[PDB]
Design a protein around this ligand. Sequence first.
Ligand SMILES: NC(=O)C1=CN([C@@H]2O[C@H](COP(=O)(O)OP(=O)(O)OC[C@H]3O[C@@H](n4cnc5c(N)ncnc54)[C@H](O)[C@@H]3O)[C@@H](O)[C@H]2O)C=CC1
Ligand SMILES: NC(=O)C1=CN([C@@H]2O[C@H](COP(=O)(O)OP(=O)(O)OC[C@H]3O[C@@H](n4cnc5c(N)ncnc54)[C@H](O)[C@@H]3O)[C@@H](O)[C@H]2O)C=CC1
Ligand SMILES: NC(=O)C1=CN([C@@H]2O[C@H](COP(=O)(O)OP(=O)(O)OC[C@H]3O[C@@H](n4cnc5c(N)ncnc54)[C@H](O)[C@@H]3O)[C@@H](O)[C@H]2O)C=CC1
Ligand SMILES: NC(=O)C1=CN([C@@H]2O[C@H](COP(=O)(O)OP(=O)(O)OC[C@H]3O[C@@H](n4cnc5c(N)ncnc54)[C@H](O)[C@@H]3O)[C@@H](O)[C@H]2O)C=CC1
Ligand SMILES: Nc1cccc([C@@]2(c3ccsc3)CC(O)=C(Sc3ccccc3Cl)C(=O)O2)c1
Ligand SMILES: Nc1cccc([C@@]2(c3ccsc3)CC(O)=C(Sc3ccccc3Cl)C(=O)O2)c1
Ligand SMILES: Nc1cccc([C@@]2(c3ccsc3)CC(O)=C(Sc3ccccc3Cl)C(=O)O2)c1
Ligand SMILES: Nc1cccc([C@@]2(c3ccsc3)CC(O)=C(Sc3ccccc3Cl)C(=O)O2)c1
Lengths: 322, 325, 325, 328
Amino acid sequence: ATLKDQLIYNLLKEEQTPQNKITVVGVGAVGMACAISILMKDLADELALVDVIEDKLKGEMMDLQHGSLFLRTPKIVSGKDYNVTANSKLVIITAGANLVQRNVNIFKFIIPNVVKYSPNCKLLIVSNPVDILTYVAWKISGFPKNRVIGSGCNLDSARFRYLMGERLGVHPLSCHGWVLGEHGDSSVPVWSGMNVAGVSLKTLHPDLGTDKDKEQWKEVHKQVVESAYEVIKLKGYTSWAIGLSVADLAESIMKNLRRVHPVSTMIKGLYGIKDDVFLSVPCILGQNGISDLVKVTLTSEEEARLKKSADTLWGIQKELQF
Amino acid sequence: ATLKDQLIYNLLKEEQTPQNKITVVGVGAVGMACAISILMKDLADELALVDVIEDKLKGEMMDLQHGSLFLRTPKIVSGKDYNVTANSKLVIITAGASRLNLVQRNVNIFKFIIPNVVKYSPNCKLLIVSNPVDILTYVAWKISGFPKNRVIGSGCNLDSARFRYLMGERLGVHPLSCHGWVLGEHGDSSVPVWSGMNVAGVSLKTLHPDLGTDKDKEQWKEVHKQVVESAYEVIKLKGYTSWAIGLSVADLAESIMKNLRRVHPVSTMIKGLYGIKDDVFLSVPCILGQNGISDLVKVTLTSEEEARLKKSADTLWGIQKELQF
Amino acid sequence: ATLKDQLIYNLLKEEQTPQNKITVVGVGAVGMACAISILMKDLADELALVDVIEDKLKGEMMDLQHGSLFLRTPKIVSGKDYNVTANSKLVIITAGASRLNLVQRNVNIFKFIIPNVVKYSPNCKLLIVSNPVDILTYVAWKISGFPKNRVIGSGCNLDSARFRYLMGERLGVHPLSCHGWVLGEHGDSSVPVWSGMNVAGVSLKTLHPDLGTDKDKEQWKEVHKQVVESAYEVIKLKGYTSWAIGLSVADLAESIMKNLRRVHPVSTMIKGLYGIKDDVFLSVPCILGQNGISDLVKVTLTSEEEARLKKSADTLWGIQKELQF
Amino acid sequence: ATLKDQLIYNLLKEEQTPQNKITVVGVGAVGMACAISILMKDLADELALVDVIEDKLKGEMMDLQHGSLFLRTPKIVSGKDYNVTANSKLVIITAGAEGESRLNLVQRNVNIFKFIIPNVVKYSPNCKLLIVSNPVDILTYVAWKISGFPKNRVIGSGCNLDSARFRYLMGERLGVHPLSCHGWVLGEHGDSSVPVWSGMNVAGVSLKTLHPDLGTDKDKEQWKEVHKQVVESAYEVIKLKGYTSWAIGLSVADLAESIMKNLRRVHPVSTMIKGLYGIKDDVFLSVPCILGQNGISDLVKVTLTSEEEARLKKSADTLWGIQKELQF
Ligand SMILES: NC(=O)C1=CN([C@@H]2O[C@H](COP(=O)(O)OP(=O)(O)OC[C@H]3O[C@@H](n4cnc5c(N)ncnc54)[C@H](O)[C@@H]3O)[C@@H](O)[C@H]2O)C=CC1
Ligand SMILES: NC(=O)C1=CN([C@@H]2O[C@H](COP(=O)(O)OP(=O)(O)OC[C@H]3O[C@@H](n4cnc5c(N)ncnc54)[C@H](O)[C@@H]3O)[C@@H](O)[C@H]2O)C=CC1
Ligand SMILES: NC(=O)C1=CN([C@@H]2O[C@H](COP(=O)(O)OP(=O)(O)OC[C@H]3O[C@@H](n4cnc5c(N)ncnc54)[C@H](O)[C@@H]3O)[C@@H](O)[C@H]2O)C=CC1
Ligand SMILES: NC(=O)C1=CN([C@@H]2O[C@H](COP(=O)(O)OP(=O)(O)OC[C@H]3O[C@@H](n4cnc5c(N)ncnc54)[C@H](O)[C@@H]3O)[C@@H](O)[C@H]2O)C=CC1
Ligand SMILES: Nc1cccc([C@@]2(c3ccsc3)CC(O)=C(Sc3ccccc3Cl)C(=O)O2)c1
Ligand SMILES: Nc1cccc([C@@]2(c3ccsc3)CC(O)=C(Sc3ccccc3Cl)C(=O)O2)c1
Ligand SMILES: Nc1cccc([C@@]2(c3ccsc3)CC(O)=C(Sc3ccccc3Cl)C(=O)O2)c1
Ligand SMILES: Nc1cccc([C@@]2(c3ccsc3)CC(O)=C(Sc3ccccc3Cl)C(=O)O2)c1
């Protein structure tokens, strides 16, 4: 008899399926930071990694497996073939190649393959331009709107709260503030909702977020955009902050928490938007993905900025060939 | 008054010393993996990062700070100057660069780092990750002037973790329940201690006396060979290794910061054991806590195992006695 | 020689002291729920338990110690003598029993406890849970002689947590995303701050102007009424409350031990606010960290809310001025 | 429109069948310690509590729900009716029943299980059953017989706590964390448990090899006292506080973690041992078992000395003696 058979008596060999499986597509700095953060948060019983660069993919999988002793995710798998992703509860897309067209072409291959092996999964899109690519994943997959989630303004809001926390000398967890709309350069800081312990900063300081503000709090949102380009300039890419923010969304979904996050969802029917566009609003996240969304009261200016983003996104999206 | 003063009334300005500070020196793939793993394990109330590449260092610090909302480490700092590292409980060194020439280049790097670390955190524990780890732990010990308990080498911690992963894969059991120790010199010359390999206290060697020999039909020696083979394979495939070392270092940091007194295979002063008479650092199971290595486990080794550690000690001392401090 | 000496070689026999010690005074249902929650959150390297009932105290300590394999707190100690509490960073008081006769009995208990706590941990933060919490936080502050930042009352922490649970149930949103503050005097006379009630920064009062009034067709005033009613209902149903308070106390302990600077509704010296001139403790949002309450949030209250806090401060002072120290 | 409808736009009202649900039957000190430990370890997305004392059950549920802000288990439910337990992955039985007969107390607990087990099976036919109620070895057998479940899905807490206490005591003597002190207590849970001296080690270094007198009466250091103290400790906690709760709750949550997360870690739990150590009867005894999503998929075959083998066989004979007389 083998040493294994001498040591262990088997009761049954019955075929089993993962109960809390997560797949990460694209093993670049973003995908790998998502992976390590998900692993250290014990959110999955199985992690699958997919990429087109086979050697890097194998190396990344092996490196994570070598740290198994320090984790509570018993199975880590990888492959170019999507059969490794079968029965995933959540599929995170961090894969990426004007730039719009080549990322749409990457999705044309990825999304049907994801849908084939995990037809009941929630899709979480991180790849940029995130608002266009969440629409692209929704269009290709044929999934209901609740199961197609864009990372959207989750990171923008996290950076905003970090900067707010630094100015006030308070932990970001206790500094509330929402950055909504189009992810990136065109995002909207909702000044009316910025508060500490339910105390509105705008009520205390009516000049908040205006050019007349002597303390120039508008700079806090300007620094959210500036910080992102600064990190790229300094280290060539960003990874840690996005990975942590994605694992926070993954936690709400995997644990059915029904916490509210600023993520990209199909906004048709709000703020005079009549087109099939995805923009960030506060969404309730759980086991069914986006089950509900918060209807934020926006000022005329804020509403106009979301409508302008929606018009620009639809302008690009109506010319898209699938 | 300012909006801050309108919103918040201050009771005291008194800002005390950080109580559970960790410093990571070198922000390459290894140091950053150590950093993220330490952050996600809530081991520090302050994290300091140091490197000579100023742009990369700032970018890495900012990227970690941007994830603050999702962490419980309220202060993340960085700088080329070691004043940012003041009052660290633990300092992790991952900085580094013919073989005697390569080691000498790391000695010259350590000649700059170690006095600067000692200046700002004289009571810290030093955790050496930089390769060749056994030699560089000796170098850090020699330069710092610290007692042996406060100078810890990552040593065979990763080698053992990989061994347990491979053992777990062969047996269909979680690595946490697969016990096995890889000791001695970190890397190619490490020693798998076959006598201690067990599941639930059941010795694999007692069940299978050929275990770890060339006459073994199942070739369990391949499990230790795969520990060394895997490391080169990861380098070939992605260019470096990061995740496994980062996780293993954070596991050591946890025992130290939380004074757990768990047993880990780390590099310590082995003079006085296995006929070793030279000032060399080799991995043995050590009890880790608030004062670093307080104790070590005296593993019963066979004549062959003892000879391999003695040969490693002789080779290490041969390189060490020629180094310029 | 001994088996221990054959197995383990000792490097140093250095006497060490805990770096993150927490003491719980009173091992009743509340005290023990605080201890298990603190243990499962890895907040302490040492946990000390104190009580006057010696058999129950020993039994509780042993029961916790027997679960050590599943915890990361290496030392659990207990005793009637306060020498077991020496060098505590945080001391949690859950000890205690006409309503006025009751207060004086708790004052008598505190006259023994507080000097003993101060003697062995002069630099600790005191966290008062025992009822009437606002009066007993004042009593602990007066007896200890500690600055106001190091005397914290559990106050409206639990009231706010229950409010957020009830708000969450009505809206179908996790309590973490349902923001609402219950301030002032803990218990029956607490104040729900309707203006701050929000989800994602969207004011419920702006959306529903009748919120918190008798005109309200949805009767949101019942949410605050149910916070008070729930507490008496749990007592009626199981005889005491433990789990919710223990979890809420461990959340405060986390901000203090980890120097998080998160904002919590806790009882603090409110003299100088809302026209209050007496030495009384009431709940306001406080920034909690390594120095206890370093700062407080100045909540804009309506004239009605301000009047309720002033009436509570007058009533608390009325009881306080008659206490014998 | 309601304030909720003004604030929130609903995408779908559809509620999925429970995905990672745990049920705790019996809300005494043991059940509630299991419940708080499971909650603080984020093992379940839904926790169900069942008991026959309706007021205490409601009070315990409400108390846990009031701490929701500090937890990541979004749904806590309770009831006397087992419809609240539907689709549980794992069902933990802690419900239990002045000097009566040995067979008398067992039959009282058997009567309770005759009501519980069919109700559990009705609403969660595919669950894993984890038995904590005493006498655990007999009651795991009873749950197995009544349920009709395959042996892999019926797990007894067994010697999990005995081993945890042993490792704590070993750790205290050696000045090492219990996580690094390895040692197995097997067989019959409680008074008749077997310390496996041959497997006692630190870093793979056998204590028995270093100290051949280990676990014998001639031992000058009396290491037998470490196992004697495991049994003595249990009675001492009962004498001092009236019951035990924290240690059992933590040990049960550790088993729940391996099952819910399919970890395949090895634990000393009670399993149907027929076919081992000359045991021919349908009895449950503790051996190291691999725990995962299908419950006990495998077991470790520990080499026992003649004396150790004899003690397990004597336990098996005693347990079968009681079981063959039980009225179902
Ligand atoms: N939405 C947000 O808040 C943030 C988004 N990002 C985005 O994340 C994306 C990725 O960032 P990086 O990891 O730094 O890029 P990267 O280029 O380093 O990694 C991308 C990976 O995708 C892979 N890939 C390409 N085509 C593929 C295919 N057909 N199937 C599977 N994998 C494929 C590549 O081989 C590559 O490994 C970018 O689009 C970036 O803009 C980054 C930070 C924040
Ligand atoms: N002992 C073990 O088990 C393992 C050790 N390693 C070792 O970790 C070390 C680092 O690995 P990588 O991060 O991939 O190398 P790396 O070259 O990518 O990073 C090294 C960093 O050290 C910095 N550095 C150089 N001189 C410095 C100085 N005087 N002060 C401060 N920083 C300085 C560099 O600028 C660089 O950022 C290597 O020596 C490697 O062999 C890696 C895996 C496992
Ligand atoms: N502020 C809040 O939000 C909440 C406060 N509470 C309060 O917590 C307190 C305790 O509750 P329980 O644990 O249920 O009461 P308990 O009576 O069961 O426990 C109190 C313990 O204090 C001990 N004790 C009495 N005198 C002592 C002394 N001089 N030194 C040390 N220990 C002494 C007792 O022996 C007893 O074990 C009560 O005052 C209760 O009102 C409970 C829930 C919430
Ligand atoms: N196996 C082990 O290692 C350990 C086992 N235990 C055992 O756990 C059991 C429970 O301990 P305690 O909580 O202290 O006892 P307890 O008497 O305080 O609690 C038992 C609960 O079961 C309930 N119950 C009774 N009949 C029921 C029924 N037909 N359906 C639902 N619930 C019912 C009771 O109402 C009661 O609330 C005991 O049998 C004890 O021996 C305790 C410690 C360790
Ligand atoms: N790994 C990687 C590679 C390329 C680009 C990036 C990017 C990037 C893009 C432009 S500047 C930084 C991708 C990306 O969307 C973000 S967030 C962000 C970007 C611009 C403004 C405001 C915010 Cl919050 C970000 O922080 O990083 C990351
Ligand atoms: N990031 C980085 C860069 C260069 C070299 C390395 C290295 C490396 C060296 C040669 S092959 C891999 C450094 C290093 O010592 C290890 S562990 C290791 C190495 C060889 C054999 C057995 C073991 Cl356990 C390891 O895994 O990684 C890492
Ligand atoms: N363990 C124990 C024993 C006796 C009394 C209590 C008490 C209690 C007191 C009066 S009614 C319930 C102690 C106590 O202050 C609380 S919180 C609370 C109490 C009353 C109203 C609103 C709130 Cl949020 C509470 O929930 O529980 C607990
Ligand atoms: N809650 C409660 C109520 C009554 C009895 C118990 C009991 C008890 C039984 C006899 S002495 C203590 C139930 C029980 O099995 C245990 S473990 C145990 C018991 C005896 C010896 C060795 C061990 Cl490890 C234990 O620790 O506690 C618990």
